[PDB]
């Protein structure tokens, strides 16, 4: 938009997931710096009234705070002058049959904002888990239009956040575990009519490829690979759903995203290359035609998912030429960086030195080098597969510091054992399956099931890490960097921690009612800086506490891995807002009382 | 003496009250041999009977099992059965083979998981048009480390209500429901000569017999002597359930 | 006990509900006073994991903190040095069919602690609403004995806190709306055997009356009134359950409590006086014989209940003679004071000047003077009848200041409207009922539905109020008083408030996640004073939030009166702990970290 | 013309589909009239239909209301009925009236709310032993604002299974479940002349008729004149249902 960028520049607003179109989560505020961090105490808090996982961050626009929820998908609007009063609320009525189709937990990942032209007022864009998309008035709270994008009966669930580009809103899809073909849709933001829609597998008509697809790098693939790489009509149920984060560039007018894993989970039933699955796409916005696509893991057999966050930057390469780049972590233990204009590959590095599923990645051809010993399809027990199906990264939102040129990220430390088996039965009937176990890695403590996390600062061009530090459980969430030598993050123990940018030493930690799986955000109201975060535990690591399970093998082995989380935290949900010295709106006690 | 039988809750073959066909057969053979039958219960479904029932020495025998099974020694056969086509009558729709073209214009079909029927659906070329429906017959739960299967009640109910045009089921499993169904139905045996496109030969009709452990040999003699003794009562009970039965070759 | 009193003398403990045997709720700490109260910020907080009402206050003994919860009545233990770690937890399981027999909400009041002799260790005593009483070891958390007290089939539910006296534990009963005949029971704490049981109605054998019952006041009633006042065998289904608070005096070895309302609701079906319902009882401990009893509201017709708190004090009357007194607020707007030893009546005053159901109370006789205009059974619309069914006081725990000799109390401001009706039907069948409405009183705004509460400071002998202030919603809960000129309380809006003791001016307020229906507590660990309080809405006022109702006439009209509470707070549940400048165990951020 | 009669969901008297006894009576009456019958439905129970529907001109007439009722004008009666005792045939517990001493030793009894049965219970001093059971039949929720009652099907099931030895119920409410009951249950009319402790007269047999609004005087006469054409259809409907019709004498 020609107006949302200017709103993004100001320090009083948080307009979109990622705070800007580069998705770097960087603020330029220095009122809270290393001189004064010991005085960070809470200012005010609210409780949603729900007991599940809370993901994402609130929105702060023109003196108002917008808060979203878990399964009922409620929405609240609050005024920053008098937080205790609720301006308006939206509580939908929905069939309680969509809980049986959710993969892992009832979650949502944010809202969207549209400023509007002179005629149509500003709008708030919202998605429901049933498969509905709605637009609400930002000042009163009615409904202008509402449509449907997913079908519950087939098994399509929608938990991704909307994303607004120019005059259009982009919607994704989820539910690949049930064998749902993935697609991306664009809608008009004023009325609700459909503009374009694209798929991941099938005939080239459905994919909407451009006439110059991958012209700079012919060895990635040109045409006819959406059906040829599959055998038969498997691509109708192939999968490849995107449920992560987007990026946008106005100069190239491009949208960048990724795609998920194929279906079914058995690699023998789908023999081929499974093209345009787990692929980085850069597409156009007005027509939706694809400009480039790169494959990371061809013919996956460990159940990974490349739908992580991508971060745009501008840096000078080894030869000294300035270039525009995108950086992308992945679940297989490799972080990639690519050219934003044509799609050339600059570097690919290893997250940790204990990865043994890939020996290296060849830059000239783009094909990774595999280790046969630590692979599946070996027909017997396989030991010490690092990383596991959870991966070293997930749906969190890392941070980027441009003045220092560093990436701040949180990494898991989990390893897996795979045991296949086959059991016969009466009349030509056999059952094939796999038992999976997860456990801490070599640098942790396997006896006591602790030491399952790390936090690191990384440089892409050189490849070396400035510092790395250890944690108790995984950092299921994101980080956020400020102007003055500071980074913030949250932990499933129920802690908010503030660290040091150049040395990594611990500087501050506080305890919140429940563990956090979101990312912190910051803003200013009137000469005062506030830092806000959600609380409420859930997601994949919290599946054993939400449903009260005791079998170690439940949840593919997540119950066994996180068996010690029960004696550190419980469920909850809400928002907490911190400030220096805890000063806030109610400093004078005679504000907001009756008469 | 006494007899210990490896049992699991699985309707309608075996029930807690003991009113199932398998329980009746076990009680009848125990009475014929003259020893009381004790029904130890295992929480897991039937597929887990051999691994955790016999290898753990908790129980002794399994009432029903496939013949020529290499895992355990099996007694002499006592009844054969196969897969059957279930269709809803008064629709002038008669199905006799998998080569009939009209099977490709039906809206939906109901077939269990890990079954030759699924392989036939993949062969004819209609698996991608029924995957979501099959996962919807049961709730959308199917973990890779746990065994799931569609119960016969849902199959017969959806056939009767007209949602599915034709179904493929196992003989002994669906006898009671079709017999007691208010809406008149039609059951037809599937030809045992099924030809695969690739050329694999997998039959459609199987023998069934009970088995004991590998080391024991006297138990087999006692069991098959008792089975020889109790032929007519077993045949009468089987005809009472009305299951389709094929002659022993 | 001869150790419990000395434990209460020390200032590091809060061993029983009420902090001592007088239920005065008074501390002797001056670290937090009028000089430094604006610098109070939260130290740390917890979330339990359930969404209902939360009543009572936590316990702190021997450096450990014990916390309870609502249905299904879990229990947690925590260490003050490292709050994050949970030492042990207990999770009971009982029949979900107990949900449908509770009147108002699924709540609980508190826990009890027994120090132990040389042989048997310390114990924690708890209650479960399925009708069960349990004892657990205070250190490990194992179960010693477990007994059953009530029957769910008849409609009996147990939501009262236990009470430990000497080597015995006292348990009450609830469920008077369904016709349950109330009783009180005493048990041994080491083994769990039954010692004695007393009943409210019936013959003198069930009453357990001593040979000198009401010897000093023959006009109250002496003998034969358990069955004489009723007609027929109605006393079998009369009622009289006690679900409030007790008090103990070791010098006279007596326990003081109150008794509930009669049943059924229709006053035409139980003619007579209905003796020993709504009665203040002073009984013995070891034998249980009733030393004295006094009835307050004979032949009730407005659905009141005498189960409120009782406080003990020592004061000089008008004649100048020192006397030992017990003070009791009531639902009908009258506050009583009595002599502990013999039961002589000293004074009875009005909570507000807008009470029109009683003109006055005669001290010489003990019979109130009634106004026929503002009563029922007139067979016509009767208006402006207040105090209403909810009353001017309820289950809250008020406070008393020994030095100033004042009582700090929270009061409601609600007035009701009563309308009876009768409907005929097919064949000699007719239905008789009433419609009730509730609204704010003359001192509030009926149109906007605000102004339903008050907080007051009161003197008994003089009979005058030092100060009185008015709030937006009813003060459902209690108060805690400190040595230096502070009074703390909580509000349904979601606030913790601290006022002045000699003027009534507001000094401090803070926004907690959700409203409070308990009372706060304070203690010390290492030279530092901490203030802890629960949060979570529920009870009778919050019905519309919990069960999501919309008819204004539902809940005996309580939904209509509190229709504005929806846009001020939401659900939740947990605990929060405040300290000066927000200092606590995590000042050094390397405590509680892995490795 | 349209009859435009008021209906409420009170099983088995009236159901949404239109298989209730009142629905058959109304349809036959309208067919005799020569005009089609129309239904107007209120969500509230039937006890409110007179107050909300008839007096606010939403509907035209009611189906079944007691005669000589001061509320509205009543037509000529078309049948008569009263309360009945229900017991099990095997138990040999024969009850003829409320004066049988054997009713004191019975463990439990079931009656409705607001009925003369509760008055009889209060006259024989058994209310205290049955109040909790009656309140537990329905869920423990009887607010003073709304109208609550025990389902007749629940009453019949409770008496048949064995929780309560003797029941008292109104005929047309439970006749259908009495006829179609697998267990052998026997029923007996209550004597008309019964005296309470005080001696006040309280009847047990009542006529039933149809009600019209006070202003409508032509419709009342027309319905009275044109209902005389169809005694046999009403008699056949009552016989098919099984209501114990008591001839007027
Ligand atoms: O294939 C899919 O549709 C899909 C969806 C989701 C989801 O919607 O959260 C997850 C996954 N896959 C998945 O594999 C995964 O690791 C995962 C973690 C989480 C979470 O909320 O923590 N969701 C998902
Ligand atoms: O008669 C009873 O057994 C009984 C029990 C309770 C209870 O235990 O909550 C209440 C009442 N009555 C009652 O009348 C009342 O107003 C009330 C309020 C509350 C509450 O928790 O806020 N409980 C009760």
The verdict on whether residue C109 carries a ligand-binding annotation is yes
Q: Are residues B66 and B153 in the same domain?
A: no
**Cβ of A443: how many Cβ atoms within 10 Å?**
13
d(CA C435, CA C376): 12
d(CA C388, CA A116): 52
d(CA A557, CA A543): 11
Instruction: Give the helix/strand (H/E) hosting C204.
Output: helix C204-207
Q: Hey, is the C-beta of A322 within 8 angstroms of any chain B C-beta?
A: no
d(CA A547, CA D142): 35
DSSP state of A42: E
| Tokens found for residue C70 | 């609502």
Q: Read off the CATH number of the domain in which B214 is found.
A: 3.40.190.10
- CB proximity list for C206: less than 8 A, separation 6 or greater: C198, C199, C226
d(CA C489, CA C519): 7
d(CA A410, CA A396): 8
> What is the signed CA dihedral for D58, D59, D60, D62, rounded to 10 degrees?
-140
d(CA C193, CA C585): 43
d(CA D71, CA C232): 37
Handedness of CA C298, C300, C304, C307 (dihedral sign): positive
Q: Are C87 and C80 in contact (CB under 8 A)?
A: no
State the burial class of residue C423 (Cβ atoms within 10 Å of its Cβ: 0-12, 13-18, 19+): middle
Of A424, C462, A214, C188, whose CA–CA distance to B51 is shortest? A424
Q: Are B81 and B246 in contact (CB under 8 A)?
A: yes
In degrees and rounded to multiples of 5, residue B121 shows phi and psi of -60, -40
Partner A, chain B 28-57, Cβ-Cβ below 8 Å: 46-47, 51
How far from A159 is each of A260, A307, A456, D149, CA to CA, in Å? 14, 13, 29, 46
Q: Hey, is the C-beta of A552 within 8 angstroms of any chain B C-beta?
A: no
How far from A103 is each of A5, A433, A545, CA to CA, in Å? 35, 19, 16
In degrees and rounded to multiples of 5, residue A418 shows phi and psi of -120, 125
Site of tokens 């958390």:
C141
- The b-or-e profile of C551-570 (16+ CB within 10 A means b, else e) is eebbbbbbbbbbeebeebbb
Q: Are A561 and A553 in contact (CB under 8 A)?
A: no
DSSP state of C485: S
d(CA B219, CA B234): 20
CA A507 to chain CA centroid, Å, is: 27
What are the DSSP E strand ranges found in C107-233? 112-114, 123-128, 132-137, 143-148, 163-165, 168-171, 183-188, 194-199
Instruction: Give the helix/strand (H/E) hosting A313.
Output: strand A311-316
Q: Are A296 and A332 in contact (CB under 8 A)?
A: yes
d(CA B87, CA B159): 7
Give residue ranges with CB within 6 A of ligand 2: C 103-105, 107, 159, 174-177, 241, 243, 260, 305, 395, 539-540
DSSP state of A174: B
Q: Are B55 and B222 in contact (CB under 8 A)?
A: no
| Tokens found for residue C363 | 């001290």
Residue C375 CB-half CA count within 13 A: 13
The verdict on whether residue C159 carries a ligand-binding annotation is yes
Decide if D248 is inside a domain.
Answer: no
Q: Are residues B92 and B139 in the same domain?
A: yes
Domain residue ranges in chain C: 1-93+501-537+572-595, 98-308, 324-393+398-476
Decide if D132 and C425 are in contact by the 8 Å CB cutoff.
no
How far from A355 is each of A443, A460, A463, CA to CA, in Å? 13, 18, 16
Q: Which of C155, C233, C435 sits opposite D132 (nearest CB)?
A: C155
Q: Are residues B177 and B93 in the same domain?
A: yes
d(CA A283, CA A285): 7
Domain coverage including residue B149: 82-189
**Cβ of A592: how many Cβ atoms within 10 Å?**
18
d(CA A127, CA C37): 45
Paired with C313 in beta bridges are C325
Site of tokens 């039961």:
C343
Site of tokens 């960087």:
A26
- The b-or-e profile of C149-159 (16+ CB within 10 A means b, else e) is bbebebbbbbb
**Class of domain C98-308 (CATH, top level):** mainly beta
Decide if A179 and B64 are in contact by the 8 Å CB cutoff.
no
Q: Are residues B95 and B183 in the same domain?
A: yes
Decide if C428 and D170 are in contact by the 8 Å CB cutoff.
no
Handedness of CA B188, B192, B196, B202 (dihedral sign): positive
State the burial class of residue B241 (Cβ atoms within 10 Å of its Cβ: 0-12, 13-18, 19+): middle
d(CA A233, ligand 1 centre) in Å? 25
In degrees and rounded to multiples of 5, residue D7 shows phi and psi of -135, 155
Of D185, D171, D214, whose CA–CA distance to D84 is shortest? D171
Decide if B101 is inside a domain.
Answer: yes
DSSP state of C161: P
Angle (CA) C71-C75-C80 rounded to 5° is 140
The verdict on whether residue C201 carries a ligand-binding annotation is no
Q: What is the SS3 string spanning chain B? A: CEEEEEEECECCCECCCCCCHHHHHHHHHHHHHCCEEEEEEECCCHHHHHHHHHCCCCCCEEEEEECCCCCCEECCCCEEEEEEEEEECCCCCCCCCCCCHHHHCCCCEECCCCCHHHHHHHHHCCHHHCHHHHHHHCCCCCCCCCCCCCCHHHHHHHHHHCCCCEEEEECCCCHHHHHHCCCCEEEEECCCCCCCCCCCCCCCEEEEEEEECCCCCHHHHHHHHHHHHCHHHHHHHHHHHCCCCECCC
Q: DSSP 3-state assignment of C177?
A: helix
How far from A531 is each of A25, A45, A498, A543, CA to CA, in Å? 13, 11, 12, 28
Residue C553 CB-half CA count within 13 A: 10
Q: From atom 1 of ligand 1, which residue's Cα is the shortest distance away?
A: A176
Of B72, B73, B77, whose CA–CA distance to B220 is shortest? B73
Decide if B237 is inside a domain.
Answer: yes
Strand order through the sheet with A345-350: A311-316, A322-328, A334-339, A345-350
- CB proximity list for C323: less than 8 A, separation 6 or greater: C314, C315, C316, C317, C339, C346
Decide if D222 is inside a domain.
Answer: yes
A300 catalytic per annotation: no
Q: DSSP 3-state assignment of A109?
A: coil
Of C454, C376, C455, C464, whose CA–CA distance to C416 is shortest? C376
Q: What is the SS3 string spanning chain D? A: CECCEEECCECCCECCCCCCHHHHHHHHHHHHHCCECCEEECCCCHHHHHHHHHCCCCCCECCCECCCCCCCEECCCCEEEEEEEEEECCCCCCCCCCCCHHHHCCCCEECCCCCHHHHHHHHCCCHHHCHHHHHHHCCCCCCCCCCCCCCHHHHHHHHHHCCCCEEEEEHHHHHHHHHCCCCCEEEEECCCCCECCCCCECCCEEEEECEECCCCCHHHHHHHHHHCCCHHHHHHHHHHHCCCCCCCC
Q: Hey, is the C-beta of D68 within 8 angstroms of any chain C C-beta?
A: no
Q: Are residues D175 and D232 in the same domain?
A: no
Decide if B195 is inside a domain.
Answer: no
Q: Which of B140, B144, B206 sits opposite A427 (nearest CB)?
A: B206
Q: From atom 23 of ligand 1, which residue's Cα is the shortest distance away?
A: A104
Paired with C133 in beta bridges are C127, C147
DSSP state of A351: S
- CB proximity list for D88: less than 8 A, separation 6 or greater: D159, D160, D165, D183, D184, D185, D186
Chains B and A make contact, 3+ CB pairs within 8 Å: yes
Q: Are A115 and A138 in contact (CB under 8 A)?
A: no
Handedness of CA C416, C419, C425, C427 (dihedral sign): positive
Long-range contacts of C215-222 (CB under 8 A, 24+ apart): C216/C342, C216/C343, C216/C344, C217/C292, C217/C294, C217/C342, C217/C343, C217/C344, C217/C366, C219/C365, C219/C366, C220/C293, C220/C294, C220/C295, C220/C343, C220/C366, C221/C275, C221/C295
Experimental method for this entry?
cryo-EM
| Tokens found for residue C227 | 């069955």
Q: Are residues D178 and D104 in the same domain?
A: yes
Please state the length of chain C. 595
d(CA C227, CA C206): 11
d(CA C517, CA C475): 8
Paired with A165 in beta bridges are A168
Task: Name the minimum distance, in Å, from the CA of D33 to any CA of chain C.
Answer: 26
d(CA A354, CA A412): 12
d(CA C154, CA A388): 55
Please count the structural domains in chain D.
Answer: 2
d(CA D167, CA D85): 6
Instruction: Give the helix/strand (H/E) hosting C545.
Output: helix C543-546
Q: Are residues D89 and D180 in the same domain?
A: yes
| Tokens found for residue A87 | 């301006």
d(CA B133, CA B137): 6
Written as one string, the DSSP assignment of C265-324 is S-GGGS-S--TTSSEEEEEESSS--EEEEEESSSS--S--------EEEEEE-TTS-EEE
Pairing of strands A112-114, A506-511: unpaired
Site of tokens 């003055």:
A484
Site of tokens 């508190």:
C110
d(CA C445, CA A528): 37
B170 chain-A contacts, CB cut-off 8 A:
427
DSSP state of C160: P
D170 chain-C contacts, CB cut-off 8 A:
426-427
- CB proximity list for A119: less than 8 A, separation 6 or greater: none
d(CA C313, CA B156): 78
**Cβ of A526: how many Cβ atoms within 10 Å?**
9
Site of tokens 């919202």:
A126
- CB proximity list for D142: less than 8 A, separation 6 or greater: D113, D135, D148
**Cβ of A247: how many Cβ atoms within 10 Å?**
21
| Tokens found for residue C421 | 């009706």
CA A69 to chain CA centroid, Å, is: 17
Of A566, A559, A564, whose CA–CA distance to A544 is shortest? A559
Q: Are residues D100 and D31 in the same domain?
A: no
Q: Are residues B164 and B218 in the same domain?
A: no
Q: Which of D47, D136, D170 sits opposite C423 (nearest CB)?
A: D47
Q: Roughly what angle, to the nearest 10 degrees, separates helices D171-179 and D231-241? A: 60
Bond into A439 cis (ω within 30): no
- The b-or-e profile of C175-203 (16+ CB within 10 A means b, else e) is bbbbbbbbbbbbbebbeeeeebebbbbbe
Written as one string, the DSSP assignment of A207-275 is HTB-TTTT-S-GGG--SSHHHHTSSTTGGGG-B----S--EEETTTTEEEE----BSSS-TTSS-S--T
Decide if D206 and C100 are in contact by the 8 Å CB cutoff.
no
Q: Hey, is the C-beta of C178 within 8 angstroms of any chain D C-beta?
A: yes
- The b-or-e profile of A127-157 (16+ CB within 10 A means b, else e) is bbbbbbbbbbebeeeeeebebebbebebbbb
Instruction: Give the helix/strand (H/E) hosting A311.
Output: strand A311-316
The verdict on whether residue C290 carries a ligand-binding annotation is no
In degrees and rounded to multiples of 5, residue C267 shows phi and psi of -80, -15
Q: Hey, is the C-beta of A366 within 8 angstroms of any chain B C-beta?
A: no
d(CA A104, ligand 1 centre) in Å? 6
How far from D204 is each of C12, D115, D122, D171, CA to CA, in Å? 73, 11, 17, 12
Q: Are C300 and C391 in contact (CB under 8 A)?
A: no
Q: Which of C90, C303, C339, C384 is catalytic?
A: C303
Instruction: Give the helix/strand (H/E) hosting C369.
Output: strand C368-370
d(CA C101, CA D142): 11
In degrees and rounded to multiples of 5, residue B94 shows phi and psi of -115, 125
Decide if C572 and A510 are in contact by the 8 Å CB cutoff.
no
How far from C411 is each of A54, A352, C245, C394, C471, CA to CA, in Å? 38, 64, 18, 8, 10
In degrees and rounded to multiples of 5, residue C513 shows phi and psi of -55, -40
> What is the signed CA dihedral for A312, A317, A323, A327, rounded to 10 degrees?
-20
d(CA D79, CA C438): 46
d(CA A305, CA A242): 9
């Amino acid at each position: 938009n020609d107006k949302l960028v200017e709103l993004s520049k100001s320090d009083d607003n948080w307009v979109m997931p990622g705070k800007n179109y580069d998705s770097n989560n960087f603020s330029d505020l220095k009122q809270i710096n290393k001189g004064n961090v010991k005085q960070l105490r809470p200012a005010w808090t609210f409780s949603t009234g729900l007991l599940n996982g809370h993901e994402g961050a609130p929105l702060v626009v023109d003196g108002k705070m917008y808060i979203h929820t878990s399964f009922p998908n409620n929405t609240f609007a609050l005024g920053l002058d008098d937080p205790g009063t609720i301006l308006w609320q939206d509580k939908p009525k929905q069939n309680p049959a969509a809980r049986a189709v959710a993969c892992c937990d009832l979650v949502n990942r944010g809202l969207a904002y549209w400023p509007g032209d002179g005629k149509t007022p500003a709008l708030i864009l919202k998605t429901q888990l049933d498969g509905n998309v709605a637009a609400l008035n930002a000042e009163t709270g009615e409904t202008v239009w509402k449509v449907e994008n997913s079908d519950i009966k087939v098994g399509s669930t929608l938990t991704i956040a909307p994303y607004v580009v120019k005059d259009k809103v982009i919607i994704g899809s989820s539910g690949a575990e049930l064998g749902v073909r993935g697609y991306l849709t664009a809608y008009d933001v004023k009325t609700g009519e459909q503009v374009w829609r694209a798929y991941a597998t099938g005939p080239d008509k459905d994919l909407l490829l451009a006439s110059d697809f991958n012209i700079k790098n012919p060895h990635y693939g040109q045409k006819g690979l959406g059906t040829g790489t599959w055998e038969g009509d498997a691509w109708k149920i192939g999968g490849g759903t995107n449920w992560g984060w987007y990026a946008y560039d106005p100069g190239t007018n491009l949208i960048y995203f990724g795609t998920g894993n194929p279906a079914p989970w058995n690699e023998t039933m789908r023999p081929g290359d499974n093209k345009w699955t787990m692929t980085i796409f850069g597409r156009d916005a007005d027509t939706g035609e694809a400009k480039f696509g790169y494959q990371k893991t061809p013919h996956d057999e460990w159940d990974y998912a490349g739908v992580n966050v991508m971060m745009l930057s501008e840096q000078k390469d080894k030869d000294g030429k300035a270039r525009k780049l995108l950086t992308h972590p992945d679940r297989n233990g490799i972080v990639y960086t690519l050219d934003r204009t044509d799609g050339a590959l600059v570097s690919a590095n290893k997250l940790d030195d204990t990865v043994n599923v890939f020996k290296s990645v060849d830059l000239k051809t783009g094909q990774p080098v595999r280790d046969p010993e630590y692979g599946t399809r070996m027909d017997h027990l396989a030991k010490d597969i690092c990383p596991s199906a959870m991966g070293y990264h997930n749906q969190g939102h890392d941070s980027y510091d441009p003045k220092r040129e560093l990436f701040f990220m949180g990494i898991n430390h989990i390893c897996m054992d795979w045991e296949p088996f086959m059991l016969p039965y009466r009349a030509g009937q056999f059952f094939v399956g796999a038992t999976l176990n997860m456990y801490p890695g070599p640098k942790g403590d396997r006896q006591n099931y602790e030491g399952l996390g790390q936090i690191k600062a990384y440089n892409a061009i050189t490849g070396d890490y400035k510092w790395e530090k250890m944690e108790r459980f995984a950092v299921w969430g994101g980080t956020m960097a400020t102007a003055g030598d500071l980074v913030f993050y949250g932990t499933l123990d129920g802690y908010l921690k503030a660290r040091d940018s150049d040395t990594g030493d611990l500087l501050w930690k506080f305890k919140i009612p429940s563990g956090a799986i979101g990312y912190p955000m910051t803003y200013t109201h009137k000469g005062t800086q506030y830092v806000a975060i959600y609380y409420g535990v859930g997601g994949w690591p919290g599946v054993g506490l939400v449903f009260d399970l005791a079998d170690p093998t439940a949840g593919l082995g997540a119950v066994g891995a996180f068996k010690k989380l029960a004696n550190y935290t419980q469920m909850g949900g809400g928002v907490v807002v911190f400030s220096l010295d805890g000063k806030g709106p109610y400093d004078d006690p005679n504000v907001g009382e009756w008469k | 003496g006494t007899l210990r039988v490896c049992a699991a809750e699985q309707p309608p073959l075996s029930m807690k009250d003991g009113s199932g066909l398998e329980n009746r057969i076990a009680t009848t053979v125990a009475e014929a041999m003259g020893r009381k039958a004790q029904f130890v219960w295992l929480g897991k479904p039937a597929i887990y009977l051999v691994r955790d029932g016999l290898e753990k020495k908790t129980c002794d025998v399994v009432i029903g099992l496939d013949a020529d099974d290499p895992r355990v020694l099996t007694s002499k056969p006592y009844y054969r059965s196969g897969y059957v086509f279930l269709t809803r009558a008064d629709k002038d729709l008669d199905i006799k083979s998998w080569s009939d073209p009209r099977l490709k214009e039906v809206s939906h079909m109901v077939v269990g998981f890990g079954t030759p029927g699924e392989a036939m659906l993949k062969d004819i070329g209609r698996y991608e048009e029924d995957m979501a429906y099959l996962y919807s017959l049961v709730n959308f739960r199917a973990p890779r480390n746990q065994y799931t299967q569609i119960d016969p009640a849902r199959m017969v109910s959806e056939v009767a209500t007209g949602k599915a045009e034709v179904g493929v089921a196992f003989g002994p499993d669906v006898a009671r429901y079709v017999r007691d169904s208010s809406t008149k139905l039609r059951m037809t045996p599937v030809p045992d000569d099924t030809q695969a496109s690739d050329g694999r030969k997998m039959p459609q009709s199987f023998d069934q017999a009970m088995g004991v452990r590998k080391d024991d040999t006297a138990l087999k003699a006692e069991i098959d002597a008792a089975l020889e003794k109790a032929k007519p009562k077993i045949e009468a009970i089987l005809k009472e359930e009305g299951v389709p039965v094929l002659p022993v070759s």
